[PDB]
Design an enzyme around this catalytic site. Structure first.
Site, PDB file in Angstrom:
ATOM      1  N   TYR A 212      -9.569  15.541  -6.686  1.00 21.36           N
ATOM      2  CA  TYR A 212      -8.818  14.701  -7.612  1.00 21.36           C
ATOM      3  C   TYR A 212      -7.969  15.552  -8.541  1.00 21.36           C
ATOM      4  O   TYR A 212      -6.787  15.263  -8.768  1.00 21.36           O
ATOM      5  CB  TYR A 212      -9.771  13.819  -8.418  1.00 21.36           C
ATOM      6  CG  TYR A 212      -9.087  13.054  -9.530  1.00 21.36           C
ATOM      7  CD1 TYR A 212      -8.480  11.824  -9.284  1.00 21.36           C
ATOM      8  CD2 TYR A 212      -9.040  13.566 -10.832  1.00 21.36           C
ATOM      9  CE1 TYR A 212      -7.858  11.117 -10.302  1.00 21.36           C
ATOM     10  CE2 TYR A 212      -8.413  12.867 -11.856  1.00 21.36           C
ATOM     11  CZ  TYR A 212      -7.830  11.646 -11.584  1.00 21.36           C
ATOM     12  OH  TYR A 212      -7.223  10.940 -12.601  1.00 21.36           O
TER      13      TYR A 212
ATOM     14  N   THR B  95     -11.222   1.525 -18.304  1.00 20.48           N
ATOM     15  CA  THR B  95     -10.628   0.707 -17.249  1.00 20.48           C
ATOM     16  C   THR B  95     -11.699   0.242 -16.270  1.00 20.48           C
ATOM     17  O   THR B  95     -12.841   0.715 -16.339  1.00 20.48           O
ATOM     18  CB  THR B  95      -9.574   1.501 -16.476  1.00 20.48           C
ATOM     19  OG1 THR B  95     -10.227   2.550 -15.749  1.00 20.48           O
ATOM     20  CG2 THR B  95      -8.523   2.086 -17.410  1.00 20.48           C
TER      21      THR B  95
ATOM     22  N   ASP C  80       0.864  -1.175   0.000  1.00 20.22           N
ATOM     23  CA  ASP C  80       0.000   0.000   0.000  1.00 20.22           C
ATOM     24  C   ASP C  80       0.902   1.227   0.000  1.00 20.22           C
ATOM     25  O   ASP C  80       1.702   1.407   0.924  1.00 20.22           O
ATOM     26  CB  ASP C  80      -0.914  -0.019   1.228  1.00 20.22           C
ATOM     27  CG  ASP C  80      -1.975   1.073   1.208  1.00 20.22           C
ATOM     28  OD1 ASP C  80      -1.774   2.143   0.595  1.00 20.22           O
ATOM     29  OD2 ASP C  80      -3.031   0.850   1.837  1.00 20.22           O
TER      30      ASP C  80
END
Ligand SMILES: NC(=O)c1ccc[n+]([C@@H]2O[C@H](COP(=O)([O-])OP(=O)(O)OC[C@H]3O[C@@H](n4cnc5c(N)ncnc54)[C@H](O)[C@@H]3O)[C@@H](O)[C@H]2O)c1
Ligand SMILES: NC(=O)c1ccc[n+]([C@@H]2O[C@H](COP(=O)([O-])OP(=O)(O)OC[C@H]3O[C@@H](n4cnc5c(N)ncnc54)[C@H](O)[C@@H]3O)[C@@H](O)[C@H]2O)c1
Ligand SMILES: NC(=O)c1ccc[n+]([C@@H]2O[C@H](COP(=O)([O-])OP(=O)(O)OC[C@H]3O[C@@H](n4cnc5c(N)ncnc54)[C@H](O)[C@@H]3O)[C@@H](O)[C@H]2O)c1
Ligand SMILES: NC(=O)c1ccc[n+]([C@@H]2O[C@H](COP(=O)([O-])OP(=O)(O)OC[C@H]3O[C@@H](n4cnc5c(N)ncnc54)[C@H](O)[C@@H]3O)[C@@H](O)[C@H]2O)c1
Ligand SMILES: [Cl-]
Ligand SMILES: [Cl-]
Ligand SMILES: [Cl-]
Ligand SMILES: [Cl-]
Lengths: 268, 268, 268, 268
Positions: B151, B186, B59
């Protein structure tokens, strides 16, 4: 090795410099390469050395040389897949008062209208193959350059025209992209430096303009052109910088003729 | 086939989507690929299918998972040549009043600081191999996007950080570049659309955002990453757009909640 | 003189430097200016000197200081028309291995999340006045800077976040823009130079980074901010460069630690 | 009101549209404005309505009309402080195969070489006043436009030439900047739309191209020009976008002639 195998590619100005590096790069990828150049010596040497590359004498400023180039490429090879508009010239340094409209026009003929003329005649065949167009612009089209008003304008035009063409040709699946090199060590670069009072100081300044600390090579622009033609199927209208980072960070920009105050008055 | 043969490459988020397409592209070029992903299922499947790819559970938001990733990559393979920072997340649409500082921070941890942490620990080994770093940013870092303030900020940061790193690392010959994909089909894209009231209308709008009239594929971002690592030796600090032309030309930008007057008062 | 008369304007970091120049510029245009600063000394001096400017002690990294700032601005003045997010910090030079995640996070708190937090709380009132947001980013967000990976990332984030906000807020008619200054002679610039072994050589290099041959002044960023707020009604999501041309042309970019070959091998 | 008081300003194409809005904006700032236009009707009306504005019949494609313009401006007013190169034309939509070299050349004469010729003759006087040059480019020079290859090329050239001039003229303290408008409601825009099968649908599409949901006004470009001339003393070589955000975010870019698959095959 085979990433562009059997595609037919026309490269203008392919007899030396960046164009020769593009020619060699496409030949290495398996393409049939038609070298277009106004100069017979370099193109004939490449054609004899490289099977797969053929030379056709052609001045891109002459509409009938380009029409014959296109007519012969199809007549001899049956298809056209890629056009690389590389033929171009950079004049010696000239202040704006040392430029003429007549000289500007002549430079637009080569750097812009040669690129336009070939593209227009090539498109009906590129549409049939879903081919692509690659224009060789310049970083200075994006960031400017001193003592080069006409040259910088032609390259600004090429980069913009690349995007308009990408929009016009995307319904046929024809991609149109440009490469904007920075300082590439070529015969043109060498000839320009040799006109300076200290040619190697000029060359060294050209190397120090990059964070990487060197100029680029024609083979590096060539690798970028084969990428755009053969593996960038989702790229259109892009400007691929091959510049060694010259556009990054702060550098020394105040010219030797520019009055600069001592650092006790930093902002006027 | 051999254009990156024997180089060691770490790909974060390599278990699916764009990262998997990058993993496969480097494996095809001959590299030893270390798949880093927080999700065991996809990485283990890629590792078992692809010899040359190995999976390491990691991670990127956990400094000790990244330290162990780096320690194990060197311990097992002896070198590090390339880091592809692909691990990232895009939240569902959120208006600015629907975002929180806590959520913004969490997104910076993954999208920016995960990329920073791995790069910092990788650099002492990349300096030894004259390797290179590839960051996966986003086109919206450059042009913005509606309902995605956090984002968009993380990706603006990644693209800028790429240029600062390129400047810091150029004295070692280490290149640092980013890829800014537009709309790539995706699992992330599919999961986001499935949250919409009409998922396929959303997908169709995502396709119509490109002049090319489709979304990109992970393999196309993968081809761009192998180019940057293996053949772009004069490129550093560049932002390679893989967008299908989405940034070109005029399009429909006034949102369905935006008051727009009738065309008899065109300019207010 | 009256081009922003009676509008209420909040300026973070307004106690000195660029922020003070923004404060003075809006006061000169007729605005009620709320100075937000963590430092009492400079803000109190501006508030006492300038009627129309009031000072409110406020650290933009503390969610409750910003909530109280907003609550008091409305409570005392009835409206909010413009937010200028100027509060920010530039660390001393730091190589990437000399940075920490903890330091990066702290810098994101001030440079990015302080800007985000105030904007989010201000928007419900800006929507009512059709006001506008101005973020003070930096040219290095666009072109990178050496030895400043964390700082460059925060400013890349601010510029990108400006465009996302512009898209989110355009249905309310709220414009969101940023100014990207280059080298501006401020107390911050002076304090950073004073940490160098030769402070005035550093300052002189900062002046030579511009074709204009000097650094900018806070009043020049201030004039650009009043333009954006009061006369740029068709501008949103733009990045207004106040840089003296530092991004133009070629300059000396290879650092003193960068191996550079002699000019007899110009391209490696 | 007095921010450009007594400065002498030449505006080409100042008889209507954006140029008239620039003329009025400089007159409002106190300047002596010399209107240059090939069309007598609009310029004479502005000259009679506005004291401070005078009209001089002048076609910028004719070297002797520009020489006489310059000679008369100095002869009558003693100085030259600012040149606004606004004269330009946008052809009706034309596919690339519907363009000619002869038409491209004619468009370069007006859009690029008219701007070059006036600037060259004006510089010896601008150098004496430390004046400045403002070029009116276009957003499509930066992002492309469909069915406008020649027009887009001329504007790409203007924007690039602006940066080269900024570099050449910075040692004299002469700033050179450009404004890139997006969709501005003008007589040109109206005449182009009226050639379409549904003019008001075209106008509405032009309004929806902006997040702000409208076109701009000439007065808004005019306010940007006065800012650049009178208050942007640290700006040179910049491209000031007056576009309503049209370059931000994703929009509908696939043209009505572009094959687009159904959304069950999103990436080909
Ligand atoms: N060398 C650099 O640093 C650099 C940087 C940016 C862009 N570029 C561009 O790359 C291209 C090639 O540059 P180079 O450095 O390799 O130059 P070069 O002079 O070394 O080679 C150019 C070639 O084009 C040919 N050519 C010139 N005019 C022609 C015409 N009318 N018709 C056909 N062929 C013609 C020449 O004969 C020559 O073989 C040019 O467009 C140039 O502007 C070069
Ligand atoms: N899909 C697009 O259209 C698009 C567009 C622009 C940019 N991008 C960027 O490309 C990257 C990949 O996107 P995608 O569409 O392939 O997404 P994805 O969700 O399909 O795959 C991302 C992968 O990263 C892994 N990952 C997530 N968080 C992680 C963590 N903390 N540590 C390690 N691994 C982690 C996930 O498990 C997953 O395997 C992201 O950075 C994304 O922002 C995607
Ligand atoms: N000076 C330059 O050359 C330059 C260049 C590009 C961008 N900038 C940016 O411009 C802005 C101002 O820079 P400057 O040079 O004027 O700096 P400065 O240090 O001179 O002034 C910044 C002000 O912000 C205040 N401030 C700092 N942290 C704060 C906090 N947590 N809460 C509230 N106020 C706080 C400080 O007390 C100070 O009054 C910054 O965002 C900086 O990154 C400056
Ligand atoms: N209108 C838009 O949306 C838009 C968008 C981007 C850029 N622009 C640019 O702005 C400028 C003005 O556009 P507009 O929409 O106001 O156009 P317009 O047609 O409304 O006005 C142009 C003016 O220039 C004059 N002119 C034309 N050719 C001339 C010549 N040879 N010599 C002297 N004067 C001449 C015309 O007579 C007219 O008065 C142009 O350069 C155009 O390309 C316009
Ligand atoms: Cl230069
Ligand atoms: Cl969007
Ligand atoms: Cl720097
Ligand atoms: Cl368009």
């Amino acid at each position: 090795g085979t990433r562009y195998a059997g595609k037919v590619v026309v490269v203008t100005g392919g007899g030396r410099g960046i164009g020769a590096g593009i020619v060699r790069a496409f030949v290495n990828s398996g393409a049939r390469v038609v070298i277009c150049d106004k100069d017979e010596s370099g193109g004939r040497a490449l054609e004899q050395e490289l099977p797969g590359a053929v030379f056709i004498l052609c001045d891109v400023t002459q509409e009938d040389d380009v029409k014959t180039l296109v007519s012969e490429t199809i007549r001899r090879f049956g298809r056209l897949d890629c056009v690389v508009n590389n033929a171009g010239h950079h004049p010696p340094p000239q202040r704006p008062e040392e430029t003429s409209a007549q000289g500007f026009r002549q430079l637009l003929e080569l750097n812009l209208l040669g690129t336009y003329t070939l593209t227009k005649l090539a498109l009906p065949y590129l549409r049939k193959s879903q081919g692509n167009v690659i224009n060789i612009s310049s970083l200075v089209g994006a960031i400017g350059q001193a003592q080069a008003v006409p040259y910088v304008a032609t390259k600004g035009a090429v980069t913009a025209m690349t995007k308009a063409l990408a929009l016009d040709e995307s319904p046929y699946g024809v991609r149109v992209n440009c490469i904007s090199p920075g300082n590439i060590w070529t015969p043109l670069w060498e000839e320009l430096a040799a006109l300076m009072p200290d040619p190697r100081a000029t060359i060294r300044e050209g190397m120090l303009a990059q964070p990487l600390g060197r100029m680029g090579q024609p083979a590096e622009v060539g690798a970028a052109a084969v990428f755009l033609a053969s593996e960038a199927n989702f790229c259109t209208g892009i400007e691929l910088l091959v510049t060694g980072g010259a556009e990054l960070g702060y550098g020394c920009k105040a010219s030797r003729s520019t009055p600069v105050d001592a650092p006790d008055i930093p902002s006027g």
